Amino acid sequence: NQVPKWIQLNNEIMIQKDGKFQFDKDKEAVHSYFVDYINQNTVFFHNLKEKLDYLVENQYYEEEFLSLYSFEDIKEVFKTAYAKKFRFPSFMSAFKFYNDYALKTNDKKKILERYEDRISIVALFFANGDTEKAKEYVNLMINQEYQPSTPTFLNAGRKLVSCFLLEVNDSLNDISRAIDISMQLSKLGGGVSLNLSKLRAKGEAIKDVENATKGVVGVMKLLDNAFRYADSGAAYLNIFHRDINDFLDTKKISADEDVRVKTLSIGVVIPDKFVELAREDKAAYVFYPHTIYKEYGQHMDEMDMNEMYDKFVDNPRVKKEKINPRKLLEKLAMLRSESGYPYIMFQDNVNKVHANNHISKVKFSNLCSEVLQASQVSSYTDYDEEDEIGLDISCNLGSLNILNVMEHKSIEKTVKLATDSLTHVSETTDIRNAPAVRRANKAMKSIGLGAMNLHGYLAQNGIAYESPEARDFANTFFMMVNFYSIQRSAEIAKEKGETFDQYEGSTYATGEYFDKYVSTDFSPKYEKIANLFEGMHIPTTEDWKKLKAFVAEHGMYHSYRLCIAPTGSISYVQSSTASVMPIMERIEERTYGNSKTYYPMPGLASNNWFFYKEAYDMDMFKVVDMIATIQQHIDQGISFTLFLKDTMTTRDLNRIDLYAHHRGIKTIYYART
């Protein structure tokens, strides 16, 4: 029943040594725990050969790509990994890896993989034939310069994507098909979310008899019950609906029998017409999209509301409903101050930067609230009858370290290796239930790249998070990685000799995304910011001009390359801080079980004490200015989590919303307290 030594060492960290903390007690809490637990619970082997034979015979890996190398090359990459002798600085480093991310035994009572082993296997999977590229993947990974996504780093050749975005058409067979597809993907752990802007409203005529539609809320109840059969999902709605108030009745603070959501996150996508109508404080008009489909031929989200609003107003066919949009703004701010629900997307601001607007307009995002692509709704008829194959969205993840890239300065080769690995993931992944997402991943070849450790690295350098220096740092750095990513995508579309589909209507084929970058040089205007960027060439606008000429020469390979997700589940094993969102506490405190670990921030001392600020005590306006500074280079959206408190008010949240709509911010996340 006795607490072991390393847990007591972690308890000893919080002992006030002259007003500070016993940080080095972590290390023994590392070092004893390696000795007393890790090295005493590992399965013994006599060599590498019998170890690999045990891995083969005990049915733990796909043996094919493992047999794409010799045993000597496998031992070479293993010796290369073990030549690091990686010394974990954090208790949570080993305390999450060998606890969760490491592949253990079948009874899960001993250790199988080491920290080098999983990384080397993932490197052999990413390289898939080459030994030296796998060693480069190791050097990108064993120095923690890159970290792949959670199922990607988890089940590389074992027994894959957490981003899925679909639509729904207005037929019962479509409803059953979508229910089936969500149940198919729910067992695979992928993040599946949708949007319901193409369904008929409550109390409408179902094709023969008047006043027959039970409403969308029954379908939401059905999907909420359907998600109770697996381990989660989400759905959206365009704002100009009569049941949009009922869309606010979903996440009601009085949890009803008739409305009881537990899994489906909601998010209201607001075009500029609604903030236009609420800004003038004039009464607005939502409509019936089935009457719109019966009158004009298309759904309401098929057309822009700013054009066709008065065209719906004067036309007597589509039935009206008149409300106050300012009261809806008040109730939205009220629900956001209650919880932080729902999400808000400025889809016109998304299309204001969207390169593939020639295909469609983005009208929704994921649960991770980051991916913004084009889409097409399918249509499913009966079983004997033939159906349709629309367009879908699937964007893989995987982050890098700002700190390790900025210290090791292999940034272009980092872009090379990360792009090749994400290309390999997009190539290998296949879906055999809904062929629409299969066709979409086959057609778009879309990837998503992000990064972490912004506040911890820059605050570790002695730079405030609320500095314009850090904003210019993000500006120049993401200009450089934008240069390298577009350079790599154009090189890859050259080397393949082939680009993604509908590349010609995008801004890359016309060079319009580079039109911002052929002028307006984002060279560092601050001295410490430039000195951090010293040691490497900063690409100017002429480099962007040659990049534009090379893109117009061949083409670009990925319709999207970048997304930013809250990838906080891997910061501990990356021995690093979170993503570009600033930290909340200098010391995380957890009760693991029968214990209290006290994990401080990595690099926490008294010099960066006030550089490691608190998220409850920051100006959010400088944060969204930084968000816009980063969004100057990101194609897709960024999951900006709002860091708020309980004492704030709804009208200041409204001012934040007007400020973000003024900044052209794409999406927002659930708020803090």
Next chain:
Amino acid sequence: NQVPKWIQLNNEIMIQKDGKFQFDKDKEAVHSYFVDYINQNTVFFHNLKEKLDYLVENQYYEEEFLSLYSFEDIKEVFKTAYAKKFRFPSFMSAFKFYNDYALKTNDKKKILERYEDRISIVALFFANGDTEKAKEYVNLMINQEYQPSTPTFLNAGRKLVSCFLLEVNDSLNDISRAIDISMQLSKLGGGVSLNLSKLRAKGEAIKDVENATKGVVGVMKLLDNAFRYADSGAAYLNIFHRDINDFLDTKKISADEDVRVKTLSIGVVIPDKFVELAREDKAAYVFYPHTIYKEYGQHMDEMDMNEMYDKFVDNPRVKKEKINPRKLLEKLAMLRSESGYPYIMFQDNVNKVHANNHISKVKFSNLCSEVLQASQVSSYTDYDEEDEIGLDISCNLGSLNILNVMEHKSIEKTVKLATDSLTHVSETTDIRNAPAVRRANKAMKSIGLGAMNLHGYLAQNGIAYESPEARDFANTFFMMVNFYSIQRSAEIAKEKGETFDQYEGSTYATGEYFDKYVSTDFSPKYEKIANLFEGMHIPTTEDWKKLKAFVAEHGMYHSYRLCIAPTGSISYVQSSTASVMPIMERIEERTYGNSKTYYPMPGLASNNWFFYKEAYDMDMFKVVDMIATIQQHIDQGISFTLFLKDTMTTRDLNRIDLYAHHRGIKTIYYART
């Protein structure tokens, strides 16, 4: 609560497959148990260096002789051991080694040493400076051609002898000193036994007042109580004592309050005078050794009974006691049929072959009943007063395989390596409580060498144990190992340039032990026996003549070289049968715990089924003839365990005793039932 797989596989061995047993179910009972238990409970290491650093820092070994080699040489002998990849054929092989003989952790919940590791460490300890000799020790050990003794193989350089033989003088200070010395050695696990032939009888005058001695039985009670303070011991008595009947009252079948022995084994050493007096069926005379000491000046066992018996008879000074020795023979046979107690030694028959009879006569042996050397009783006065340092006996152990030597045919180099290792053990061992045994081990330099797997190897070749072929086999083989052992001892006394002490009065300095061997060639008289010995030169009498000339040239190093002990505790890990005693069962059956292992004999099939006979169904006369055939080459005694039954009678046991006295048999062991 479920029985694991390998135990069920061992249970599957006894399943009657067409009247036989499922022998190969052992192997999976090996092989799964290696997989499911052994390789899952070993402490992980990254290399050899950190493993040795853990062994150093965790205080597991004497680091000095380990630092007498480079890390590369240690890795060379480790690679040499692991290049064997020794495949255990028996369940009891791993089931005793990694259970008991392997050094485990401090909490004893994981494995530290491997099967190669302990052997290689023992080899480095035996070599103590040389790498190649340690590899030769490995090849002698990893092929199971030699096995050292239990503490020697156990604690080689860790945190030593099981043979100790002392005497007692007739003073209270001597009694307290001997009690102290036995208590000193009892905590060290050594086998300590004594003899009480120099104490005054019961009811005698203690130096001033008549009828004051409480008797020897109180001292035996005291030693029995004293052995209750540690984890065992023994004591003897010469037969011509008045309390010798009381010596039979010790192991009384009615366990008394007043006599309650639980640890002290007894054994009556019978000279030829007693079998002379019992043979003629005439009344015999025991005496009072204190009156003998007061009259003639010496104890009774100082002089021969055959000479001085009538000189004690006609002298009126020494008080007589007249008994029937045939009734004592009857009661001795009765107690031997009850249990098997006590032991019987024909000390005149021992001195009939004893080379160092110029020193003294052997009057006692150990609990292992094998070692027969010369001795001198000490005398201890008061604490301020000065004492005496007599002579003692300490003979180390360690056996070899008849099977592996007879198959690998490195018999002379086996003698070389075994003699050098036993020399190293005798050099390193030191005692710091009783300096008499320290002086005795420093002076005699006496070793003991034995062997095992006689019945199993020869019966595995298709030879009956009750054959004269096997007797001639033992004759020729032990002639050859006698040749090689005397050759090695003479070579060693040449290389040192120095022999043991009082070598000149021994028969080796006069060549009288070779006088039996300069004639009477022990070449094999049987064809299969010779064909087993074919492939190597058999030394004739001329080789013994050159050996005699080389011994007379320099000298011999060890006063004794050979002893045979029941070393059955290591046959399982040696994957072999017992010593030269024949087997009792073809299949040992044990209930380990919550289980029933069924370990057959190694090599048990239907062809050697009737070669693997049963010890209850053999002629003991052929066995003692084989014993005499072996004793034709052994210097010391051999622990011949009597294999008897319940249905036999005491008079046949008497005929066995007369037959063994006719054969010149030195000692006998406790009998079977």
